[PDB]
Amino acid sequence: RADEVDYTNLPAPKPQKTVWDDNIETEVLRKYLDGLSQYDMEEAKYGV
Amino acid sequence: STKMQTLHKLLTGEVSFKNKAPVKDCNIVHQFGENWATELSAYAKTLPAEQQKIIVRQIARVKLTRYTVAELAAYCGDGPALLDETARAANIEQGVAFVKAKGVEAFEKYVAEESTNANWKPEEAKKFIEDVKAKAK
Amino acid sequence: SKFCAMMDLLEEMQHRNRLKPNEESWTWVMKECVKSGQFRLGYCIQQVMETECKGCPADLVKANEANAQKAKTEGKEHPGHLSQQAGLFDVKVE
Amino acid sequence: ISGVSPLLYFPPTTTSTTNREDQINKNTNIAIQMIKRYKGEVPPHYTRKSSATIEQVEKEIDALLGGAEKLRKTSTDDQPMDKLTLMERCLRHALWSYHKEEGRYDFDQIGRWVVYTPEDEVKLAQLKREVEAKEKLAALRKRREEEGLPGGPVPRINWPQEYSSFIDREPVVAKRIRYDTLASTTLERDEKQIES
Amino acid sequence: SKQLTFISAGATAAVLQSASAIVSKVAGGRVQTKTAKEAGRHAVVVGPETPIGVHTAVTEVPKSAQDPLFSGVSTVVVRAVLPRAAPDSVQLRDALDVYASAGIDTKEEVRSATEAFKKSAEVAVGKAKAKGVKRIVLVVKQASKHNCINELFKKISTETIESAGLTTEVVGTAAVANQLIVNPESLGVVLLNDVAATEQIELAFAGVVGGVSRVYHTVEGGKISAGHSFKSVALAVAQELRELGLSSEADKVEAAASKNPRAVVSAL
Numbered sequence: 081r082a083d084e085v086d087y088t089n090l091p092a093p094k095p096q097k098t099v100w101d102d103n104i105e106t107e108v109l110r111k112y113l114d115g116l117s118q119y120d121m122e123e124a125k126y127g128v
Numbered sequence: 129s130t131k132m133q134t135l136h137k138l139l140t141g142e143v144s145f146k147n148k149a150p151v152k153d154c155n156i157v158h159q160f161g162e163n164w165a166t167e168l169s170a171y172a173k174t175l176p177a178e179q180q181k182i183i184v185r186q187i188a189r190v191k192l193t194r195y196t197v198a199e200l201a202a203y204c205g206d207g208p209a210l211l212d213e214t215a216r217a218a219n220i221e222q223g224v225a226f227v228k229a230k231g232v233e234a235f236e237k238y239v240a241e242e243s244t245n246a247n248w249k250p251e252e253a254k255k256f257i258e259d260v261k262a263k264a265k
Numbered sequence: 266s267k268f269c270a271m272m273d274l275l276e277e278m279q280h281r282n283r284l285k286p287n288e289e290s291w292t293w294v295m296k297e298c299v300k301s302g303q304f305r306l307g308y309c310i311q312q313v314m315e316t317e318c319k320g321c322p323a324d325l326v327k328a329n330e331a332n333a334q335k336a337k338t339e340g341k342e343h344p345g346h347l348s349q350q351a352g353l354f355d356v357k358v359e
Numbered sequence: 360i361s362g363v364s365p366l367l368y369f370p371p372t373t374t375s376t377t378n379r380e381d382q383i384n385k386n387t388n389i390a391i392q393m394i395k396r397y398k399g400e401v402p403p404h405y406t407r408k409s410s411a412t413i414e415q416v417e418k419e420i421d422a423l424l425g426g427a428e429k430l431r432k433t434s435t436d437d438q439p440m441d442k443l444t445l446m447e448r449c450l451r452h453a454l455w456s457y458h459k460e461e462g463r464y465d466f467d468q469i470g471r472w473v474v475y476t477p478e479d480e481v482k483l484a485q486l487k488r489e490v491e492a493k494e495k496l497a498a499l500r501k502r503r504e505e506e507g508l509p510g511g512p513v514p515r516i517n518w519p520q521e522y523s524s525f526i527d528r529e530p531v532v533a534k535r536i537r538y539d540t541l542a543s544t545t546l547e548r549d550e551k552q553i554e555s
Numbered sequence: 556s557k558q559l560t561f562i563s564a565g566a567t568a569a570v571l572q573s574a575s576a577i578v579s580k581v582a583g584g585r586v587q588t589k590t591a592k593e594a595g596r597h598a599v600v601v602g603p604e605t606p607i608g609v610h611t612a613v614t615e616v617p618k619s620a621q622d623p624l625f626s627g628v629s630t631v632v633v634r635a636v637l638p639r640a641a642p643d644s645v646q647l648r649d650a651l652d653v654y655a656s657a658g659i660d661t662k663e664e665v666r667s668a669t670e671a672f673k674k675s676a677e678v679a680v681g682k683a684k685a686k687g688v689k690r691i692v693l694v695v696k697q698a699s700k701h702n703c704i705n706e707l708f709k710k711i712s713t714e715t716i717e718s719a720g721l722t723t724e725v726v727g728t729a730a731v732a733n734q735l736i737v738n739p740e741s742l743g744v745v746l747l748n749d750v751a752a753t754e755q756i757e758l759a760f761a762g763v764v765g766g767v768s769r770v771y772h773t774v775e776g777g778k779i780s781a782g783h784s785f786k787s788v789a790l791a792v793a794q795e796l797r798e799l800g801l802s803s804e805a806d807k808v809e810a811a812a813s814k815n816p817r818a819v820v821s822a823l
Binding site: 140141148150151152185186188189190192193197198200201202203204205206207208209210211 | 603622624729730732733734736737738741752755756758759761762763765766783784785786787816817
Binding site: 385388392 | 643644645654657658659660
């Protein structure tokens with residue numbers, strides 16, 4: 081009868097960076113879209 | 129024995145998760161199990177009255193935690209006991225608006241797709257779609 | 266990729282088996298290039314058939330050109346990120 | 360995504376009635392607002408010493424430079440310049456600087472009569488990309504509006520995968536809230552107002 | 556003769572109509588009920604949206620209206636509210652963070668934000684001193700976007716609180732929200748930086764407790780009641796009537812709110 085499991089341990093939510101379609105509209109908004117992706121990843125890591 | 133002891137400490141706040149993640153209903157369900165509430169309630173009966181009351185209170189609070197902050201703010205304004213009915217009515221109203229906007233057959237498939245995203249039981253999904261359809265007319 | 270598999274198969278046949286691909290084999294490759302929309306590989310296969318074989322099925326040559334000009338209208342002639350202007354310090358070296 | 364969720368998240372479309380007019384209008388109001396603060400105060404008024412139109416000045420310059428065409432002689436770039444060449448360069452430089460400031464972005468002549476520092480070639484390239492980018496964006500935003508496609512950008516996402524990957528629906532729902540709101544709005548500003 | 560000022564900020568007409576019926580039926584016509592968009596005293600604001608002219612957004616757990624689930628809890632949630640401009644104009648909470656990225660000067664906006672935070676910090680420490688707690692909990696959203704407004708908020712809130720002699724513990728939004736909903740007895744005084752997420756958290760706490768009325772402290776100096784649901788609005792009106800000097804009417808409204816939340820007007 082050895083250790084079974086650490087109920088405290090939780091697998092971290094593996095974030096995925098959103099990918100935008102490569103159109104001209106993306107190039108004009110490249111910086112803005114990148115900021116949204118960074119914000120999305122930050123929200124996923126922290127939770128909200 | 130260890131699982132119940134860990135769960136009791138976790139709900140009481142004595143025991144934190146590895147990454148200090150929020151103690152929500154979903155996380156507990158993920159680790160302890162789907163029916164963690166039932167086993168915990170049975171275990172609590174072997175504890176003094178004060179601990180039993182705390183377990184019941186913590187369980188009720190955790191169930192309230194099953195909603196997002198925005199949903200609680202919008203729907204839980206008039207108390208927690210009335211939260212479930214208010215949330216159900218708002219969801220039904222959204223379903224009616226969706227049906228009136230983009231037909232029914234598309235609504236049927238979308239409800240199924242959200243049931244897939246919702247882990248909704250087929251019976252619950254069928255009941256919801258029937259209720260919204262009846263509400264329409 | 267179907268094209269990669271067939272080309273590798275031809276490589277095995279010609280080199281490791283000493284068998285010259287015939288017209289039929291190249292036609293299948295050209296059909297796959299046309300079907301998949303890869304209009305640049307079709308040009309290369311077109312020359313191969315015009316070099317080793319005797320020309321190319323004119324039906325497939327025209328089909329490939331139609332696909333190419335569709336890309337020109339839609340702008341999918343090259344991947345867009347290549348067309349973006351860059352600089353000495355404006356390139357992200359992963 | 361363990362745990363039976365309570366709701367069938369519908370698309371957050373609730374105020375689809377966001378008339379492109381007023382949506383873009385508020386964008387233009389914000390755009391004009393930010394620009395004024397960044398620049399500052401409207402410069403003090405100046406009274407012209409003489410009255411003359413830009414077209415008249417350009418015509419006069421062309422007439423002046425047309426009579427010396429026979430006398431004008433080309434030479435190597437490193438060789439010394441002539442009086443006619445110097446006058447032409449100065450006049451055209453001033454004229455095209457004025458035109459570019461006004462808005463007549465004719466790159467072909469600007470790159471010739473204003474480029475004298477690699478800095479200017481860089482500026483021309485930067486301006487050339489910007490104009491083409493705006494033209495393409497307007498064309499697709501119009502073609503997107505004709506199809507009824509959502510004026511705003513839409514990310515390449517498969518939410519069924521996302522609802523599975525994540526354990527808690529809250530971040531996923533919030534992510535769906537934002538993008539759906541973003542796609543339901545027109546990200547444009549009336550440039551007629553910006554130009555003034 | 557007297558006047559009660561009703562402000563509407565994102566509230567459905569049903570709630571406003573219910574509030575008007577409640578006051579008319581309970582007051583009996585002695586005090587008129589006028590509608591406006593800004594006030595400093597004798598004002599009730601209906602709707603989740605924050606009105607114009609409020610700098611502090613305190614909320615508590617009233618003893619009378621404690622839900623059985625949250626019986627005995629005592630925690631004060633104060634949200635700092637920056638000055639609100641017109642809807643079309645860029646709000647300060649967003650201007651303070653975007654102008655810096657754009658390079659625009661941000662001196663006046665910083666000064667205005669500093670004044671608002673100082674007032675909110677003074678309110679928070681006063682509540683903490685009154686309750687006797689030694690440490691307060693600052694709540695700042697950890698998003699990369701809000702890397703400037705929160706930084707100023709922390710720099711000023713900690714400065715004022717430390718000057719007062721109390722301790723400060725900084726935390727994010729998700730962890731505090733989960734703690735406040737699940738284990739709120741471990742938090743005595745929690746200040747919230749001005750963000751949309753914090754506003755939702757304040758509303759969720761005000762609703763989960765059983766429905767309460769939030770107190771807004773305005774620039775002019777005073778307290779105005781705020782509600783978002785039938786019960787919360789009813790409690791807000793009851794407190795407002797109590798402030799005007801009506802005890803029996805306030806008690807009746809409070810009792811009606813406790814009994815029949817969604818239909819208080821018919822209940823009383």
